[model samples]
Target chain A: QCYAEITGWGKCLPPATLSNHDLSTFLDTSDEWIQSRTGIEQRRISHVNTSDLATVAAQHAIACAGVSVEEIDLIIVATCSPDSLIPNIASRVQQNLGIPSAAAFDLNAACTGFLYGLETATRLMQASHYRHALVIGAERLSFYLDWTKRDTAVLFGDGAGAVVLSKTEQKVGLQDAQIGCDAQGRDILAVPKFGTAMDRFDADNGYWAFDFVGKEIFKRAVRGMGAAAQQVLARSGLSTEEIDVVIPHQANIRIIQTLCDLAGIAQDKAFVNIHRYGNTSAATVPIALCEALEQGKIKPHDDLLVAAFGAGLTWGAGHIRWGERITPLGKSDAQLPSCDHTALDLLSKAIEHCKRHQ
Target chain B: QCYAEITGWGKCLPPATLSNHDLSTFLDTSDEWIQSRTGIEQRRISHVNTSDLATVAAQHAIACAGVSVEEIDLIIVATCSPDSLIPNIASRVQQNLGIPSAAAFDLNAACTGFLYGLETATRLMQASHYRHALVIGAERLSFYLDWTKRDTAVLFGDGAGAVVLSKTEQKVGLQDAQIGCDAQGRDILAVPKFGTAMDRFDADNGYWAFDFVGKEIFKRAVRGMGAAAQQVLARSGLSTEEIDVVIPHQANIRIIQTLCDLAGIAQDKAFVNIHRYGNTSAATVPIALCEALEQGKIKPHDDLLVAAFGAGLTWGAGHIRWGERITPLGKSDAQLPSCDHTALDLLSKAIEHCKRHQ
Candidate 1:
C-alpha cells in the first residue's frame, strides 16, 4: 500500500534578478544593511500576474508527477496575490494547465499558506474524493509593496512552488499536522494598511498602500515558528532529536537561526534558502521542500517537519515521513536551458493555446 | 458513517435600498427600460466597508448555526472586495467572530464562491479533520462598480451569507460537486480596472475604468452553469427531477429563469431571491439559500443543487442533501429588553470587556 506522497514538484521563477545592491540605488538602503539585518542578498522577482506564476508551476508539477493534465482531480492554490479580485486561483490554474473541469480555488492563509494548503490537500486526498491534487504556493508581493518604503519592500520577492499530492494505499507519508493563529499577535506582523476600514478612503480614491512594522513582526515570527514546531513534534510522538530535516518558512535568516537554536537542531539540519529566494510568502515552505528534495537532504522514511508563520498572524506545522525515495524523474545534472527566452516562448504559447481553446 | 452537511445558514443584507428609479435619476436609463432588460426591482445597498458587511453576516451565521463561537474549527471567507488588498478574509472573520485562533483565510471564485466553499469545506469535513467549519460568501460589489458607468452600477448590490458545515451521520447532506473555469473566456466578465498593472493610474484616469461586454458574458454564463450542473448531477447519479431546491447564483433573474428552463426544472423549484438581492456577487447563492431554508422551501432531506457563474469565466455546481434541521440554541421568539436608553451603557461594557481581554 502506498501513502499520500509528493509524487512530483516544479517551480516557476522570474527571469530578472535583483541584487541588494541594485535595490540600494532605488531606495535609501545598502547591501550591508539589508544582508546584515535581514540576511537576504538577492531575490527572484516576477513580472507576470499571479495567475501566470501559478500556471507555470502547475504545468511543471503535473508533468513531473508523470500524469497527463486530464488526470488532475483537484487544484488548490495558496496565494495572497491573485490575478483578479476573485476567489478562484484554482480555476485559473486549471484553465492554464488545460484542466478546466477540475475542482479549484485559492486558499489565503497568508505566509503560512503552503503548510495550510499541504494540510488541506492531504485531507482531501484521505477523503478519497480526489486521486490527484495540485497544491501550489505563489505570491506577487511586489504589487502590494510600497516601492518607496525600504522597510517592507526589501523583505519580499515573487515566485511560485508546486507539488502534486496523490493517493496511495499505504500510510507512509503525512503522519501528522497542526495549524494555529494568535489574533493578539496579528498586528505585530501584518500589512496594516491595505484591507481594512481605514482603506475606505483609499478605495474610493483608487490607491492601495501596504504598511508593516519590522522589528515587532520579526520577534513574533521567531517565537511562533519555535513554538509551533515543538507542538507538532509532541503531537506526533517524535522527539526533536529524531527529526532528519527542518524546513522553516523563508522569512529572515536570523529568525531561522533562532528557530534552529530553540529546536536544538544544528544549522545543517535545517534547510536555509532564504538568502537565495527572499521572502516568497506562501511560496517559502514548498520551495524549500523542493530544494531540499533536490539536494538529497530528505531520505526515505526520514522524519520531516515543516513550519511557517506569516501575515493574518497565520502559522502552521506539517509533519511528514519521507516515503518511496525513488530516483528523481530526471537528473538535475542534465544541462537544462535557463528559464529566459525559453520561458517567454513557452508562456506565450501556453497563453495562445488557452486563448484558442476558450 | 457521518457526512458533511449544510445544517444552518444565515444572511445579512445592507439596509440601504436602491430602485431602478434611483439609477434613472442619474443615468440615461429609465425604470421601464431597466426592468424590461433586467428583472431587478430593488437591491439592498451598503456604503460601509466590505469587512463591516462580512462581519454582519458572520454574526448572523454563528447565531443561526446555534454553535458557540468557541466551537468553530475553521473559517473560510470567500469575497472579492477584501477589506485590504491582502487576501486574508478568514482571519478578519475569525477575529470578528471571537474565534481568532481558528484556521482561517479567504477564498475567491467570484460569483461561484459560495458553492466552491461548500465543496471545499465538505471535503475537509469528510476527511475527518474538523467537526465544524464556517464557509462565508460575502462581497461588496458596489465598491468595484463605476458609478458613472450606468452599465455596471445598476447591476450590483451589497450583502453576505454564511453556512456552518458540521459533521453529521445523517444520510442527507452534501452529495456531489463539480468546479471549473475557462481562462479563454476571462475577458467576458471582469472588473477591467483595479488590477496590479493598472494600480499606478488615478481613480478617474481612463485606464482605471471597468470594462465589460454584457451580452457575451450572458451567453457564457448560461453555458457554464448549465454544463457544470449537468456534470455534478451525472457524478452524483442524480437527476434534475430529484432536486427539490435549486439555488442559482443571483447575478441576473434572466439567467436563473433560462437555466431552470434548460435544466427542465420548474421555476418554483428554483430559488428566486435574486430579484430582491440583485447581483451580490459571491454572496448570491448562500443568501438565496438562507432565504429558501427560512421559508421552509428547503426542508430537511430535500435534494438541493447550487450552480453559479461569474468573472474569471468561473462556474461550479454543488449537489447537497438537506441536512438535519438545526434548531437555534436561543429561541427565535425570545423576549429581550428594549435598548431605549441603555444602548450606550451596554456598548461601554462591551468595549471595556474587549480591552480587558486584550
Candidate 2:
C-alpha cells in the first residue's frame, strides 16, 4: 500500500501589515483590547486575491519538495475567499504554476479546510497513485470584513500556506485523522450576503458584512476542537503526552490554550503565530506549520497532534508521524508581486464605504 | 480494499420554468434559434438559493438509499453557484438534513464538478472507513447571468442532483476515473465581475455578469472532454462500446454529440437532458444520471461512461459498474420551498438592472 508523505512546506504572507493601531485609527478599540481578546497584534493584508496567494505558496512548496511541476497530478486549494469560482482558484494556481494538466479543485470547510484538504489529498494519493499532490490553504479574509465592526474585523487577516505530499512506500504521514462539523453554530460565524444567496435585484448587494458572535464562537471552538483532538488521539491509541508538537488553528489565543489545556496538552507545546498574523481562516494552520519549522519547533521524526475550529463550526484533528527528515530539499525565490498600497491605503476605499453605510 | 457503491440517486429541479419563448420577450433570443443551436427548449430557474435545492435533493437521496442521516459520515457538494461561502453551502445542507456530524465540504470545478466529486469521494471512501457518503451537484446559475446577453444567458439553467454512496466491498462503483483541466482556456468562458476580485468599494458592487466566449468554448469543451474520456477508458481497459449508457454534462447538445461521435459512443447510448434543463453548470451530469435511471436507460450491472467539460476548461470522466437494484428504497416527501414568482417575474430585477446598465 502506498502512503502520502509530507515533504515540502511553504508560506506566503502579504507584505502589507495591518496593526491593531490601524484598527484603532478609525474605531473605538485599543491595541491592548485587541491583543488581550484575540492575541493578535498585527496581521497581513493582501494586495492580491486568493489565487495569487495560492500560486506563490504552491510554487514555493514545489520548490521545497524538489519536484517538477510535471510530476504534480492533483491540486486541492482550501479557500473560502477565492478570487473567482467559474474556474476555481485551484485551476488558477495550476495555470499560474504552468502545470499543464491535473485534477484541480477548490475546497471550502472554513478554517478547518486545510486539514480537510490534507486528508482528502492523502487518500486520493493512495487510491489514484498520484505522484505528487499540492494541498494548499489560502484565504483573504480581510475581504469579508466590515471595518465598522471591530469584533469581526480585528480578528482576521490574509495569507496563504501550502504543503507538498508525494507517494511513499513508507508508512509515515497522517496516520489517524478526524474531521467534523457543528452546523448548528454555522449562523453564529457567517457572512450573510457572501454568495449567490444575496438579493440579486438590489443595486447595492455586494457588501460582505460579518455576523459574528464571539462568545459563542469561543465556546463552540473550544469544545469542537477539544473533541476532535481527543478522537484522533483515541483512534491512534496514544496519549497527548506522546505528541512532540501540537499545531492548533491560530484563531484566538484563548481558544488555542483552552483547548490544549482541556486535552491535557501543555501550553508551550502548541505552535502558534497568531500574534503576528491573526486568523487567516484556513491559512492560519499551514502558515503556522511553516513558521514552526523555520523556528525549529518541530524536529525530524516527531509526532504531531493538529486541531482546528472555525466558521461553519467546522473542526478537524490529525495525528501525524514524521519520517526521517523535516528539512526542505531546497527553497525558491518565488515571491508575491509588489504591493503599491499600504494596509491602510488598501483599506481606504472599504473604510470610507463602511463609514458611509454606517 | 473497500469500494464505494452508488446506492441512491435523486434530483431536484426548481419548480419555475423559463422557456426559450420567455427569452424572446426580454432578449434577442428565439425559441427556434435556441432549439436549433443548443436543443434547450426550456429550463428551470431556482426560486431558492443553491443550498435549498441541495438540501431537498440530498433528502431525496438519503430517503432513496434508506439510510439515516446519522449514518452519513461525509457530504460533498459540487457547486459553482453557492448561496454563501463563509461556512460553505455543504454545512448548510448538513444543518438542513439534520445531520449532526459529517466531514462536509463544498467543491468547485465548474460543470465537471460532479465527476470530480465522484472520483474524490470514491478515493476518500477507500481511504477512510466512512459508512455513507452523499455526493451532490447543485447550481443556481441565474444569479450570475446577465439577462441582456443572449450569447451567455440563453444556454443555462438552475437545479441540483445527488447520489448516495455507501461502503461496498464489491468493487463495483467508479472502477476508473479521470479528472483534468485546460486552464489555458479558462478565459474562454467566465464571469468577470464575480467573487472577491470585484471592486469592493463600489457602492453598486453586486451585479454578476458573464464574460462568455462561446466560439472558443465549443472547441475547448470538445477537446477537453474527449481527452479525459480517452484517459479513463484507456486506464480502465474497456472499449467504449461496452458501456451501456453515457452520462455527459448537459451544456450544449452539439458538444455532447461531438464528444459521443469522437469517442465511438453510439448517439442513442448517450443520455440527453439538455432539452429540459439546458446547462445547469455543475448540476448537469448527476441530474442527467438520475433522469437516466428514472427513464430506465440504466440497469443493474450496467457499465457506464460519464464525461463533462466547463469553465476552468475542466473536464472529467468516470467508468462506473452497477451492482444492485436500480430503484429507490423509498421515495421522499421532501421538496423545494414554494415559489412566490414565475421565472420571468423572479428575474425582473436582474432584467431591469441589465437594461439600465446597458
Candidate 3:
C-alpha cells in the first residue's frame, strides 16, 4: 500500500498586524478583555485577496518539497473565503504557480478544512498513481466580519497555509482521519446573509457579516474536537500519551484548553498560536502546523494529532506520522506584493464602508 | 480491496420551464439560432436555492437505495451556485434529510464537479470504513446570470442530481477518473466580479454576472473533455470501443459531438440531453446519468464513460463499471415545494433588477 508522505509545508501571513489595542480604538472593547477571553493579542490583516495568500503558500510548499511544478498532479484548496466561486481558488493557485498539469478544486469544511484536505489528498494519492498533491487552507475571514460586532469581529484574522504530499512506501504522513458535521448547530454560527439564499440584488444584503453564538459554539467546539481527537487516535491504535504534538484549530484559547482537558491531553502538548493570529478559519490548522514545524517542536517521525471544528458545525481530526526531514529542500523568493497601508488603515476603510451601508 | 458501487440514483428538476422561445421574447435571439448552435430547446428555472434541489434529489437517492439516513457516512455536495457558503450546501442537505451522522462538505470544480465528487467519494470510501456516501451535483446558475446578455442568458438552467455509493465486493462504480484544470483560461469564462476579490460593500458589485468568451470556451471544452476521456480510459486499461455508453457533460450539442469524435467514441453511443436542460453546470453529468438509467440505456455491468468541463477551465472524465441493480429498491414522494411563479416571471424579475442596477 502507498502512503502520502508529508514532504513539504509552508504558511503565508500578511505583513500588517491588527493588535487588540488597535481594535479597541474603534470598538467598545479593551486589549486586556479581548486577550483574556480569546487569547488573541493580534492577528494579520491582508491587503490582497484569498488567492494571493494561497499562491505564496503553495509556492513555498513546492519549493520546500524540491518538486517541479509539473510533478503536482492535483491541487485541492480548502477555503471558505475564496477570491471567486466561479473560477475556484485552486485553479488560481495553479495559475499562479504555472503548473501546466494538475487537477484542481476547492473544498469547504470551514476550520476543519485543512484536516479534511489532508485526508482527501492522502486518499487520492493512495488510490491512484498521483505522485504529488498540494492541499492548501487559505482564508481572508476579515473580509466577512462586521466591525460593529466586536464579539466576532476581533476573533478572526487572514492567512494561508499549505503542504505537499507525495507518494511514498514509508508509513508516514496521514495515518487516520475522522471528519463529520452536525447540521443541528449550523445556524448557531454562520454568515447570516449574502449567499444564494438571500436576495443577491438587494443593496441591504451587500455587506458580508458573521453571526455566532459564543456560548453555544464554545460548548459544541469543545465536545466535537475532543470526540474527533479520541476517535482518530483510537483508529490509529495510538494512545493520548503517544501524541507528541497537538496542533488544533485556533478559534479560541479557552476552547483549546478545555478540549485538551476533556481529551486528557497535556497542556504542554497542546500548541496554541491563537494569541498571535486569532482564528484564520480554514487557514488555522495548516498555519499552526507550519509554525509548529518551524519552531522545531515537531521532531522526525513525531505522532501529530490535529483537530478542528467550525461552521457547517463541521469537525475533523487526523493522525499524521511525520516524515524524516524537518528542513526545506529548496526555497522560493515568492512573496505577496508590498503593502503601503497599516492594518488600522484597512480596518478603518472597511468600518467606514459598513457604517455608510447602514 | 473495497469498491464503491452505485446503489441508487435520483434527480430533481424544477417544474417551471424556460424555453428558448421564452428567452427570445426578451433577448435579441431566436429559437432556431439556439437549437442550431447549442441544441437547447428549454431548461428548468428553479424558484428555490441550490440546496432545495439537492435535498429532493438526496431524499430520492436514499429512498431508492433503501438505506436509512443513519447509514450514510458522508454527504458531498458538488456545486458552484450554493445556497450559503457558511453552512455549505452539503450540510443543508444533511439538515433537510435529518441525517444524524455524516461528514459534509462542498466541492467546486465548476461543471466537472460531479465527476470530481465521484472520484473523491470513491477514494474516501476505499481508504476509510465509510459504508455509504451521497454525492449530489446541484446548481442554481440562474441566480448568477446577467439576464440582459443573450450570449449567456439562455445557456444556463437550474436543477440537481445525486447518487448513493456503498461499499461492495463487486467491481463496480467509478473504476478510473482523470480530473484536470487549465487556470490560464480561467478568465475566459467566469463570473465578472464578486466573491472575495471585489469590494464586498459596494452595491454595484452585488450583481453576479458571467464573462464568457464562447468561441474560446468551445475549443477548450472539446479538447479538454476528449483528452480527459482518453486518459481515464487508458488508466482503466479500457479502449473507447469498450465503453457501452458515454454520458458527456450537457453543455453544447456541438461540443459533445466534437468531443465524441476527437475521443474516438461512436457518435451513436454518446448520450445527448442538452436540448432539454441546457447547461446545468455541476448537475449535468449526474442528471444525465440518472436520465440514461431511467431510459434503459445503461444496463447492469455496463462500462460507462462520463466527461465534463466548466468555468475553472476545469475538466474531468471517469469510467464506471455498473452494478447489478438497475432499478430503485424504493421511491420517494419528496419534492421541492410547489412554485406559484412561471419561468418567465422569475426571469422578468431578475431582468428588472439587473436593469435597475445598470
Candidate 4:
C-alpha cells in the first residue's frame, strides 16, 4: 500500500526581472497602470530553456527531501513551453540529475498543469511502486509573448517550481482532487499557431501567436477556480473557518481575490506573489506553495486548498494536509546559472523582430 | 475501489495513401529499398488536424462502449503531434463529442505515449470515484517529415486509436505497467527543432526537421522493450509462454522479431500492422490493439502484453486481462471528413519549399 506525503519543496526564478517600468519603455503602458490593472509590478524573463529551470527546482526539492537522486521512481513535468518536446522536459530533468531508474513524461494542462501533475503523481504512486516522485510545473511563457501587444505581453513570466511526493503510510498529502475542462471557450486563451495547424513555410513572422480575451478570461477564471475550490473544500468536510490557507493560481490579483471571495474564504488566507513574478502559468501554484512553506504560513496538519485555471479551459483544485514537519529535511545549494544580459536586453531582438513582421 | 476494464475499441486512418512508390517518384529511393529495411509499405497522410482523427476514433469507441458520452469522467490523449498545445487535443475531443463533464489533458511519451496514458488513466480511476475514462493515442507525424531524408520519411504515418476503460469489479483491463526513459540516447532519436530549442526567426526551410540513427534506435529499442516486457511479465506471475497475445509497437519488422526472441515469446503471438499504417508514433500501440481485437486475436480471459519505445527515449510495457466480452456492445457511424487531395500532391509544395531553402 502506498500514500503520498509531500516531503520536499523548491522553486527557481530566472534572475532577469522585467518590471512594469521596463514595460513602459517600449509598450504603450506605465508602471502605475500595469500595477493597478494586473497587480503585477514585474516578472522574470529566462535566458535559458524551461528544462534548465525545472532541473534546478527539482534538485532543490530532492535536496529538501533528503533523498538520493537515483532513488526517484518517477519524474513528471507539467510544462506548456518545454525547450523540446521530443526529449520531453521530464527526461531532460532525469538526465540532468542522472536518474538511472525512473518513469518520466511531460503533461500539459496549461496553467493548471502543476495541480494536475500533483494529483496524477499521487495516484500513480498509490497504484504502483512509485515511492518517490518529482512533480514539476515549469513555463517559458516569454518565448510566446507578443511584445507589441501590451495587454498579454505584461501578464506572463518565466519560472519553474517542484515538489517531491514520497510514499508514506501516514494520512497526509493530497486528500481530495477535482479536475475538469470547459472547452466551449477553448479559443479564448491560446497560442493558436503553436502547433501543427501552423504553416511551417510561413517563416517571415514568428511561429507563435497568442489569443487572449481579457474580459472573458477574468470572468471565466474566477468561476472555474471558485467552483472547483468550493467542491474540493466541501469534500474535505471542513468548515470554511477550519481551512488554514489557500493557494490559487497567481494569474490576476482580482481573479485570486474573487476566487477567495467566491469560495467563501478570506482573501488574506490566500497567498500572493504575483507582484514578484507575474503569472508564470503552470509554475505559479507550486512556486507559491514553496514560498508559503518558507515563510512559515503552513503548520503541521494545516488544512490547505489550491485552485487553478488556464488554457484548454482546464481547471482543478486540490486539498492537502500538511504533515508533521514544516521545515526542510535539508537545504540545497542549487541555483540558476548566472545571466549576462538584462531582461530587456534579452527580449530586445525578438521584440524588434516581431515589430518588423507587424 | 476501482479497476479498469476496456469496454470498447476503435481506430481511424486518414484516406490518402503515401506508398513507397510515391516517395520513389520524388526522392532518389526505390520501393524495394524502403520496404526491405522498414516494415512499412505505405502510410496514410492526414488532410486534417490530429484532433480530427482522434475525435472520430473516440466517437467510435464511445459508441461501442454502450455508454452515454456525457457520463465519461476523463479524456486523455497521448500524442507528440497535437494540432495545438494550449487547447490540448483532449479538450478538443471533449468539445467535439459535446461531453459536458470530464477532466482532459494531453500527454507525450512519444511512441510509448499510449501505454503511459493507459496506465495513468487506470490508476487515476482507481484513485478517485471516476468510472468511465477514454484513453486515446493519435498522431499526424507526416507534418515533420524531411522529404530529402529517405530513411526516416518512409517510416511514419497518420492515424488515431481509442479505448473506453470503464470501472469494473471483474479485475479486467491493465494489470501491470512498467514505464521508463533512457535519456542517454535521447539525442539519437529526435525532432531537434520541434520546440523552444529552435530559433523562431529561422523559418524559410520549414520549421520542422528530424534526426534518426537507425542502428542506435534498433539496438536500444529492443533492449528497452525486452527488459520492460520481462519485468512486467515477471510481476504478473505468469510465464512468458502463458501470454496469449502480444501487441507491440508497430515500429519495424526486425525489431519485433528480435523483441519476441529476446523475451522468449513466439513471434506469431504478436499482432502487427506496420505494413498498412507505418509507425504512427503515439498511435502505434493503440491502433495495433484495436486491430488485434477486431481480428479476434483477443478473447475472454486472454492474457495480453504490449510494449512501445519512442523519442524522449521513452519505453513501456503493459499486461492486460480481457473481460468476458470480445464483441462491441454497440456500434457508431462516426467517420473522418473526406479529403480532396492525394498524399503526394499535398506534400508537393512543402517539399519544393524546403528544397529552395536548402
Candidate 5:
C-alpha cells in the first residue's frame, strides 16, 4: 500500500545562462574561488518569470510520464517565488495544464521542499484517492539574490524540475523518509528580516532585501542534511551499500562532499550537478535526479536517496527505487514546413491571405 | 482504509471583545446597520501576537483529541497570520506541544484552507501513513484590516480554531468534497500587496501593510460560496433537505442568508456565529461547528455541509455525516483555573521575553 516508485522526471533551465567568470566581472569575487568553493560554473538565468520556468518543467514531466491530464488527480508545487499573495502557484499549474478535476496547492519548506513534497505525494498516492500526482519544485533564488553582494550572487540560479508519482504494483519503491525543522537555527541561513516581526524596511531606502550568514549556513547544511540521510537509511532498514545513488541538495560542492564524508558514503555514489545549476533551492534535488536518469546513471532496481536543506532551516530525505520507466516514452514526430516555421509558413500564409484580400 | 473522524475541537478568542455599538462609536456605520448587513454584534481582538492565539487553540485541541503528543504523525496548520516570511506555523505548534516526532507544515487557501485540509488529512489517514492529523485554521484579520477605513475594520476579528482528525471505523463520516480557485476574482478581496511581489510596498518607508476592496468581495462571496455548496451537495448525493446542519464561513450574515435562500433551506438550518466571532477567515466554520455541537444542535447521524470563501478567490465545501462523539459533553468535573487563562499567554510571553527584553 505504500512504496513510492519514480515514474517520470523532467527539468527546465532558463534560456539565459551566466558563467562564474561573468559574475566575477561585476561582483567582488573570482571564478576560481566560486568554482573551488561552490563548485558552480554556469547556472541558468530566466529572462521570463518563475511561473514560466515552473510550467515548462511541469508540462515536460507530465508528458514524460505519458499520463493524460485526466489521470492526474493532484498537483503539489513547492516554491518560495509565488506569483501572488492570493493565488498560489499550484492553482496556476492546474489552470495552465487545463486539469479541472485535480486538487492543486503550493508548499514552502525552504530547500527541503522538493523532498518533503515527494514524500507527501507518495503518501497521498498510496491512499488510493489519487492515481497520479504532479510534484514540481521551482525556485527563483536569483530574484532574491543581492546582485551587488558577491557572496550571495555567485551561489544562485533559476530553474524548475518536476516528477510524476502514481500508484504502482511495484512494492520496492519509496522505502522511508524524514522531515525536521529547527527554529533556533533559523538565523543560520535566512532572508532574516522580511517577516511580520521587524518588517520595518523602506523600499525607497532599499532596506527590503535578503540577508544571510554564509558560514553558519554551511555548518548547518553539513550537519542537518548529512544526519538526515543517515536517519532515513537506518529507519528504512537499508545499509549504505544498498543505496546506489544519493542526490543531495545543490547548495555547495564543499557541503556535498562534507555530507558524503560525514554520512560515510562513497563520493562516486552521490550525484552532483550543482556545477551546472548552482543552488536552485527547491529545484536542486529534482533537477539532479532528472539529469542522473537521463545520463543513464540510474537503472532498474537501484536504490536512490534524495535529500535537501533550505530556508525555514528545514531539511528532509526520501528513499525511492529507480526503474526503467513507468510508462514507455512517447514519440512526438510531426511534419513541419521548415525549421523556422514561423518565418516560412507565416510568410506563405500572409501571401495567400494577401491574394484573397486583393 | 481511511476514515479520520473529528475527535477534538479547540478555540481561542481575545479577552477584550467589541460590541456592535462599540463599532458604531468610531465608524460612520451604526450597530443596527452592522448587524443587519454583516450579522455580527461583536468580534474578539487579540491582546497579543496572533501566533500566541494559535498556540492556545492548538493546545486545547490537542487536549480534547485525547492523544499523547507522541502519537501524532502529522501537524497541518492552516493560517495566513504566520509570524515570519517562512510561514511555518506548524513548527510553532509543534514547539508549543513539544511534539518532535510530528511532521508539520502550513497551508494557505484563505478561508477554504480548513475545508481543504480536512480532505488532505483524510487522504493521509486512508494511506495508513498517519493515525492522527491536527488541522488548525487561525487568522489575525485585525492586522490586515485598515482601522482608518471604517468599511473593513468593523468586519474582522482575530481568533483561531483547531480540529483533530483521527482514524475511525464508521459508516457515517465525511463523504465527498469539492474545492476550486478562480484567479480572475483573486484581486476583489485580497490584501493586494505584501507577498513575493516586492514592489507592492516601499519596504524602506515602513508603508508595507494590507489594503482591501469590500464591495466586490461581498458580491463574489454571494456567488462563489453558494455555487461551491451546491457542487458539494450534488457530489455527496445528498439533498438540501437532508442537511441537518449547514456551516458557512462567517464572512457576512446576509451572505449566509442568501445561500440558505438559494439552497431552499430554512434560516435555522444554517449556523450563524458571525455575530459573536465575526469573520475569522478559515477558523470560522470549524469553530462554529464545534460550538454548535456543544449546544446539541448537531447530533450524530446528522447530515452536515461546511463551505467557505475568501482570498485566492478560492472556495470549497465538504459534505460530512456528523459522527458520534466518544466522550459525553459537560461531564468533565475539571473546572477552569481559579484564575482565568486570559488568552494572552503567548502575547504576554512574547512581550515579556522578546520585546521587553529587547
Candidate 6:
C-alpha cells in the first residue's frame, strides 16, 4: 500500500495588520470587547488577490520540499474566496510557479477545505501513480465582508498556507480522514449574493454580504469538530493521549476549547493562534499546522489530529503521522507586493466605497 | 484493489429550446451560417439556477442506481457556473435530495470538470471505505453570456448530468486517467469579470463579459484533448482499436473531428451530440455519456475513452470499462418545473437588462 508523506509546509500572511482597535475607529466596537469574545487581537489584510497569497505560499512549500517544479503532478487549491471563477486559483498558481506538467483545479468545502484537500490528495496519490502533490488552503475573506456589519467585518482575515505531499512506503502523512456536511445548517453561514444567483442589474450592484448567526454556528462548530475528531481517532485506533498535537480551524477560541473538552484532549495539547489572525476560513488549519511545526510543537513520527468546521456546514478531521524533517530543505524569497497604507487606511477606503454605493 | 463502477447515469435538459433560427431573430448571424460553421442546431435555455438542474439529474441517477439516499458517502458538483459560492452547489443538491450523510464539495476545471470529478471520486472510493458517490456536471453558461456577441452566445446552453459510482471488483469503471492544465494559454478563453478581481461597483455592474479567442482555443482544445487521450491510453496499456466508443467533449464539431483524427480513431466510432446541445461547458461530456448509453452505443464490458478541454486551459481523459448492467434497476419520475416563457423571451429579457446597465 502507498501513503502520502508530508515533505514541505509554508504560509504567507499579507503585511497589513488590522487590529481590533483599528477596526473600532470606524465601527462601534472596542478592542477589549472583540478580544474577549473571539480571542482575535488582529488579522492580516491583503493588498493583492487570493491567488497572490497562494502563489507565495506555494513557492515556499515547493522550495521547502527541495523538489523541482517538474516533480509536482497535481495542484489542488482549497479556496472558497478565489481571485476569479473562470481561471481557477490553482491554475493561476500553476502559471505563477511555471510548473510545466501538473493537473490543477480548485476545491471548495469552506473552512474544512484544507482537510478535504489533504484527504483527496492522499487518496489520489495512493490510488494512482502520482509522485508529488501540492495542497493549498487560501482565502481573502475580507474582500466579501460588509464593513457596516461588524459581526462579520471584524471576524475575517486574509492569508494562505500550503503543504507538499510525496509518495512514501512507511505510514506517514494522512492516516485516516472523515468528511461530512449538514445542509440543514447551511443557511446559518453563507455569502448569499456571491455567485450567479445575484441579479447583476439590481441597484445594490449585487452587494450581498456575509450573513452569519454566530451563536447557532458556535454550538454546531464545536459539536461537529468534536464528533469528527472522535471518529477519525477511533478509525486510526488512537486515543487522545496518543496525539502529539491537535491543530484545528481558528474560527473562535471558545469553540476550540469546547471541542478539545468534548474530544477529551487537554487544552494545552491544542494549538491556538487566533489572537494573531482571526478566522481566515479555508486557510486556517494549514496555517495552524505550519505554525505548529515552526514552533517545534510537533516532532518526527508524531501523531497529529486536525479538525475543521465551516460553511455548507462542512466539517472534517484527519489523523496524520509526521515525517522526519521539520526544517525546510530550501527557502524562498517570494513576497507579496509592498503595501504603502496601514490597515486602517485600507479599511477607511473600503468603508467610503461601501457608503458611496449605498 | 477497489474501483468505482458506473452504476447509473442520468441527464436533465431544460425544456425551452433556442434554435439557430431563434438566435437569428436578433443577432446578425443566420441559421445557415451557424450550421455551416458549428454543428449546433438547437440548445436548451434554463429558467432556473444550475443547482435545480443538478438536483433533478441526481435524483434520476440515484433511482437508476437503486440506492437509498443514506448510502451515498459523497457528492461532488463539477461546475463553473454555480448559483452561489458560499453554500456551494453540492450542498444545495444535498439539501434538495434530503441526503442524510454525505461529504459535499464543488470542483472547477471548466469543461474538463466532470472528468476530473470522475477521477477524484474513483481514487477516493478506491483508497477509502466509501461505498458510493454522486458525481454531477452542470452548467448555465447562458447566465454569463453577452447575447450581442454571436461568437460566444450561440456556442453555449444550460443543462446538467450525473452518474452514480459504487464500489466494484470486476475490472469495471474508471481504469486509468490523466489530467493536465496549460495555464500559459489561460487568457485565450475566460469570463473576465465573474469574480472578486472585478470592480463590484462599476457602472457596468461588474459586467465582466466573457473573452474568448475562438481560433486559438480551438487549436489548443484539439491538441490538448488528443494528447490527454493518448496519455491515458498509454497508461492503461490499451490501444485505440481496443476502445469501443470515444466520447469527447462537445465543444465544437470541427475540434472533435480533428481530435479523433489525431488520436487515430475512426470518426464513426466517436460520439457526437453537439448538434442538439451545443457546449454546456462541464456538463457536455457527462450528458453525452448518458445519451450514448440510452442510445445503446455502449455495451457491457466495452472499453470507453472520454476526453475533455475547457476554460482553465484544463484537459483530461479517462479510460473506463463498462459493467454488465446497461439498463437502470429502477427509474425516477423526477422532472424540472414547467417553463412558460419561450427561449426568445428569456434572451430578450437578458439583453434588455444588459443594455439597461450600460
Give a tens-digit lDDT track for model 6, residues B189-260.
Answer: 887567767666565754567889999998888888888898889888888988999888998888888988
Per-residue alpha-carbon lDDT of model 2 for B249-324, expressed as tens digits? Answer: 9888999899999989899999998999999988898899888988889999999999998888888888999887
- Once fitted onto the true fold, the runs of candidate 1 whose alpha carbons sit more than 4 angstroms away are A1-3, A26-28, A86-89, A192-209, A325-358, B201-211, B237-239, B331-358
Compose the digit string of candidate 3's lDDT tens values, residues A273-339: 9999999988998888888888999999999989999998999888999989988898889999999
Error of 4 at B63 (Å): 0.7
Docking class of 4: medium
Prediction RMSDs, each to the true structure: 8.4, 1.3, 1.2, 1.3, 9.5, 1.3
Q: What is the TM-score of chain A alone in each candidate?
A: 0.87, 0.98, 0.98, 0.98, 0.88, 0.98
Scored against the native two-chain complex, candidate 6 gets a DockQ of 0.73
Worst 10 residues of 3 chain A by lDDT: A200-209
User: What interface RMSD do all candidates show, one decimal each?
Assistant: 6.9, 1.3, 1.2, 1.2, 7.5, 1.3
| DockQ value for model 1 | 0.28
The Cα error of candidate 1 at residue A260, in Å, is 2.8
lDDT of 2 at B160: 95
Cα lDDT of model 3 by residue, B302-333, tens digit: 99999999987999889999989989999999
Question: How does candidate 3 score on lDDT?
Answer: 0.89
lDDT of 3 at B181: 92
lDDT of 4 by residue, B1-358 (tens): 5589999898999999999999888788888987888878989999889999999999888888898887898999999888887778899999889887588989988999999999999999987868899999999998888877787878999999999999988888999999989988788888867787767777543646688888999999999989999899989999998999999998998999899988889989999899999999888888888889889999899999999999878999999999998888888888877788999887888788766665
Error of 4 at B65 (Å): 0.6
Give the per-residue lDDT digits (tens) of candidate 5, residues B71-149.
Answer: 7777776666565545355666676666754566666677777887777777667664577878888777655544445
Off by over 4 Å in 6: A356-358, B355-358
DockQ of each: 0.28, 0.75, 0.75, 0.75, 0.20, 0.73
Worst lDDT window (10 residues) for model 4 chain A?
Answer: A200-209
Give one digit per residue, the lDDT tens place, for model 5 in A77-187: 777666544456676667667665566667767778888788777776775456788888887765555555677778888889888887777775566777766545655
Q: Encode model 6's per-residue lDDT on A31-101: one tens digit a residue.
A: 99899999999999988889999999999988989988999999999998888889787998998898876
* Candidate 6, pairs of clashing residues: none
| Local error of candidate 6 at residue B19 (angstroms) | 1.2
TM-score of 4: 0.98
